[PDB]
Scaffold this motif. Structure first.
Motif, PDB file in Angstrom:
ATOM      1  N   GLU A 281      -7.752   0.039  -2.679  1.00 40.48           N
ATOM      2  CA  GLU A 281      -8.954  -0.360  -1.963  1.00 40.48           C
ATOM      3  C   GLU A 281      -9.021  -1.857  -1.666  1.00 40.48           C
ATOM      4  O   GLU A 281      -9.411  -2.240  -0.566  1.00 40.48           O
ATOM      5  N   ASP A 282      -8.643  -2.692  -2.634  1.00 39.75           N
ATOM      6  CA  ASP A 282      -8.612  -4.136  -2.422  1.00 39.75           C
ATOM      7  C   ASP A 282      -7.604  -4.535  -1.366  1.00 39.75           C
ATOM      8  O   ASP A 282      -7.886  -5.320  -0.494  1.00 39.75           O
ATOM      9  N   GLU A 283      -6.406  -4.004  -1.470  1.00 41.06           N
ATOM     10  CA  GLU A 283      -5.386  -4.328  -0.508  1.00 41.06           C
ATOM     11  C   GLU A 283      -5.895  -3.969   0.893  1.00 41.06           C
ATOM     12  O   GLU A 283      -5.699  -4.744   1.838  1.00 41.06           O
ATOM     13  N   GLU A 284      -6.558  -2.811   1.026  1.00 43.49           N
ATOM     14  CA  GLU A 284      -7.124  -2.393   2.315  1.00 43.49           C
ATOM     15  C   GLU A 284      -8.097  -3.420   2.850  1.00 43.49           C
ATOM     16  O   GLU A 284      -8.089  -3.733   4.025  1.00 43.49           O
ATOM     17  N   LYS A 285      -8.928  -3.951   1.969  1.00 45.60           N
ATOM     18  CA  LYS A 285      -9.751  -5.102   2.289  1.00 45.60           C
ATOM     19  C   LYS A 285      -8.824  -6.251   2.639  1.00 45.60           C
ATOM     20  O   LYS A 285      -8.927  -6.862   3.686  1.00 45.60           O
ATOM     21  N   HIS A 286      -7.909  -6.532   1.736  1.00 45.81           N
ATOM     22  CA  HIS A 286      -6.959  -7.612   1.912  1.00 45.81           C
ATOM     23  C   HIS A 286      -6.318  -7.598   3.300  1.00 45.81           C
ATOM     24  O   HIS A 286      -5.915  -8.638   3.828  1.00 45.81           O
ATOM     25  N   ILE A 287      -6.160  -6.408   3.862  1.00 46.73           N
ATOM     26  CA  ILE A 287      -5.413  -6.232   5.105  1.00 46.73           C
ATOM     27  C   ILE A 287      -6.330  -6.390   6.325  1.00 46.73           C
ATOM     28  O   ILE A 287      -5.918  -6.839   7.388  1.00 46.73           O
ATOM     29  N   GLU A 288      -7.595  -6.048   6.168  1.00 47.72           N
ATOM     30  CA  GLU A 288      -8.538  -6.276   7.225  1.00 47.72           C
ATOM     31  C   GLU A 288      -8.816  -7.761   7.397  1.00 47.72           C
ATOM     32  O   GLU A 288      -8.997  -8.229   8.494  1.00 47.72           O
TER      33      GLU A 288
ATOM     34  N   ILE B 161       0.791  -1.227   0.000  1.00 45.20           N
ATOM     35  CA  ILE B 161       0.000   0.000   0.000  1.00 45.20           C
ATOM     36  C   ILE B 161       0.824   1.278   0.000  1.00 45.20           C
ATOM     37  O   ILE B 161       0.423   2.263  -0.610  1.00 45.20           O
ATOM     38  N   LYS B 162       1.960   1.280   0.690  1.00 43.46           N
ATOM     39  CA  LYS B 162       2.662   2.531   0.956  1.00 43.46           C
ATOM     40  C   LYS B 162       3.108   3.035  -0.362  1.00 43.46           C
ATOM     41  O   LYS B 162       3.004   4.222  -0.663  1.00 43.46           O
ATOM     42  N   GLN B 163       3.602   2.093  -1.149  1.00 40.23           N
ATOM     43  CA  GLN B 163       4.134   2.372  -2.468  1.00 40.23           C
ATOM     44  C   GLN B 163       2.982   2.793  -3.412  1.00 40.23           C
ATOM     45  O   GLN B 163       3.142   3.683  -4.267  1.00 40.23           O
ATOM     46  N   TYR B 164       1.832   2.131  -3.251  1.00 38.29           N
ATOM     47  CA  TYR B 164       0.578   2.566  -3.865  1.00 38.29           C
ATOM     48  C   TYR B 164       0.210   3.986  -3.505  1.00 38.29           C
ATOM     49  O   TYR B 164      -0.062   4.821  -4.394  1.00 38.29           O
ATOM     50  N   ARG B 165       0.247   4.277  -2.216  1.00 37.14           N
ATOM     51  CA  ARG B 165      -0.120   5.591  -1.769  1.00 37.14           C
ATOM     52  C   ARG B 165       0.919   6.587  -2.274  1.00 37.14           C
ATOM     53  O   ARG B 165       0.570   7.708  -2.598  1.00 37.14           O
TER      54      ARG B 165
ATOM     55  N   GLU C 211      -6.847 -14.207  -6.036  1.00 44.05           N
ATOM     56  CA  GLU C 211      -7.621 -13.825  -7.208  1.00 44.05           C
ATOM     57  C   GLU C 211      -7.577 -12.329  -7.510  1.00 44.05           C
ATOM     58  O   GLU C 211      -7.452 -11.948  -8.672  1.00 44.05           O
ATOM     59  N   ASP C 212      -7.677 -11.492  -6.478  1.00 46.26           N
ATOM     60  CA  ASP C 212      -7.580 -10.046  -6.660  1.00 46.26           C
ATOM     61  C   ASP C 212      -6.218  -9.626  -7.170  1.00 46.26           C
ATOM     62  O   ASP C 212      -6.103  -8.842  -8.081  1.00 46.26           O
ATOM     63  N   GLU C 213      -5.178 -10.136  -6.550  1.00 44.65           N
ATOM     64  CA  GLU C 213      -3.846  -9.791  -6.969  1.00 44.65           C
ATOM     65  C   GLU C 213      -3.683 -10.153  -8.450  1.00 44.65           C
ATOM     66  O   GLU C 213      -3.107  -9.371  -9.217  1.00 44.65           O
ATOM     67  N   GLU C 214      -4.201 -11.321  -8.855  1.00 37.56           N
ATOM     68  CA  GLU C 214      -4.137 -11.744 -10.260  1.00 37.56           C
ATOM     69  C   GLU C 214      -4.795 -10.732 -11.171  1.00 37.56           C
ATOM     70  O   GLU C 214      -4.279 -10.414 -12.225  1.00 37.56           O
ATOM     71  N   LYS C 215      -5.938 -10.219 -10.745  1.00 36.85           N
ATOM     72  CA  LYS C 215      -6.557  -9.081 -11.398  1.00 36.85           C
ATOM     73  C   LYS C 215      -5.590  -7.915 -11.312  1.00 36.85           C
ATOM     74  O   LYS C 215      -5.235  -7.302 -12.300  1.00 36.85           O
ATOM     75  N   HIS C 216      -5.168  -7.621 -10.100  1.00 31.64           N
ATOM     76  CA  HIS C 216      -4.257  -6.525  -9.846  1.00 31.64           C
ATOM     77  C   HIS C 216      -3.072  -6.522 -10.813  1.00 31.64           C
ATOM     78  O   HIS C 216      -2.497  -5.473 -11.115  1.00 31.64           O
ATOM     79  N   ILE C 217      -2.663  -7.707 -11.245  1.00 32.71           N
ATOM     80  CA  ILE C 217      -1.444  -7.866 -12.034  1.00 32.71           C
ATOM     81  C   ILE C 217      -1.737  -7.719 -13.533  1.00 32.71           C
ATOM     82  O   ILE C 217      -0.908  -7.258 -14.310  1.00 32.71           O
ATOM     83  N   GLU C 218      -2.937  -8.082 -13.945  1.00 29.35           N
ATOM     84  CA  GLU C 218      -3.325  -7.867 -15.309  1.00 29.35           C
ATOM     85  C   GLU C 218      -3.525  -6.387 -15.591  1.00 29.35           C
ATOM     86  O   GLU C 218      -3.215  -5.916 -16.658  1.00 29.35           O
ATOM     87  N   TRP C 219      -4.062  -5.637 -14.648  1.00 31.75           N
ATOM     88  CA  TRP C 219      -4.245  -4.219 -14.907  1.00 31.75           C
ATOM     89  C   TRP C 219      -2.851  -3.613 -15.061  1.00 31.75           C
ATOM     90  O   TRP C 219      -2.602  -2.802 -15.952  1.00 31.75           O
ATOM     91  N   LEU C 220      -1.922  -4.023 -14.211  1.00 32.51           N
ATOM     92  CA  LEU C 220      -0.612  -3.489 -14.365  1.00 32.51           C
ATOM     93  C   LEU C 220      -0.062  -3.761 -15.748  1.00 32.51           C
ATOM     94  O   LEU C 220       0.462  -2.858 -16.396  1.00 32.51           O
ATOM     95  N   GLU C 221      -0.198  -4.990 -16.221  1.00 34.28           N
ATOM     96  CA  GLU C 221       0.362  -5.341 -17.514  1.00 34.28           C
ATOM     97  C   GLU C 221      -0.358  -4.563 -18.590  1.00 34.28           C
ATOM     98  O   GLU C 221       0.249  -4.026 -19.492  1.00 34.28           O
ATOM     99  N   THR C 222      -1.662  -4.471 -18.488  1.00 33.58           N
ATOM    100  CA  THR C 222      -2.386  -3.715 -19.469  1.00 33.58           C
ATOM    101  C   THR C 222      -1.830  -2.302 -19.517  1.00 33.58           C
ATOM    102  O   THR C 222      -1.506  -1.794 -20.588  1.00 33.58           O
ATOM    103  N   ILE C 223      -1.701  -1.654 -18.369  1.00 37.12           N
ATOM    104  CA  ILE C 223      -1.233  -0.275 -18.384  1.00 37.12           C
ATOM    105  C   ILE C 223       0.254  -0.128 -18.614  1.00 37.12           C
ATOM    106  O   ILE C 223       0.739   0.959 -18.887  1.00 37.12           O
ATOM    107  N   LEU C 224       0.997  -1.219 -18.510  1.00 35.58           N
ATOM    108  CA  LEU C 224       2.387  -1.162 -18.943  1.00 35.58           C
ATOM    109  C   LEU C 224       2.494  -1.321 -20.463  1.00 35.58           C
ATOM    110  O   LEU C 224       3.513  -1.003 -21.044  1.00 35.58           O
TER     111      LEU C 224
END
Ligand SMILES: [Mn+2]
Ligand SMILES: [Mn+2]
Lengths: 48, 48
Positions: free
Chosen positions: A34-41, A14-18, B34-47
């Motif tokens: 937002e997901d990570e924040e969920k992820h962390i709770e 998150i920190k790097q995100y923020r 599953e979220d991170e996997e999503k999280h990682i596709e968005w990164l690739e898309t935007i890269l």
């Protein structure tokens, strides 16, 4: 501890995100955050 | 590169997620994955 270690990476994540969000208004970045924040709770919940 | 760096942490993240999943059938762990996997596709898309 495995669970602490993940709670630890996420918290590092998150920190790097923020950081990026101090500078760039990129909604998809804010949406990961937002997901990570969920992820962390969930981690905290399951850590008790 | 900031974007690469996040793609890098995420990629580091999942592995540790997947490690736990070799051992424990914890649906919430599989749900973060599953979220991170999503999280990682968005990164690739935007890269690009
Ligand atoms: Mn996460
Ligand atoms: Mn992620």
């Amino acid at each position: 501890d495995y669970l602490r270690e993940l709670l630890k990476l996420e918290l590092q994540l998150i920190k790097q995100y923020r950081e990026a969000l101090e500078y760039v208004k990129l909604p998809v970045l804010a949406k990961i955050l937002e997901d990570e924040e969920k992820h962390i709770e969930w981690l905290e919940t399951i850590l008790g």
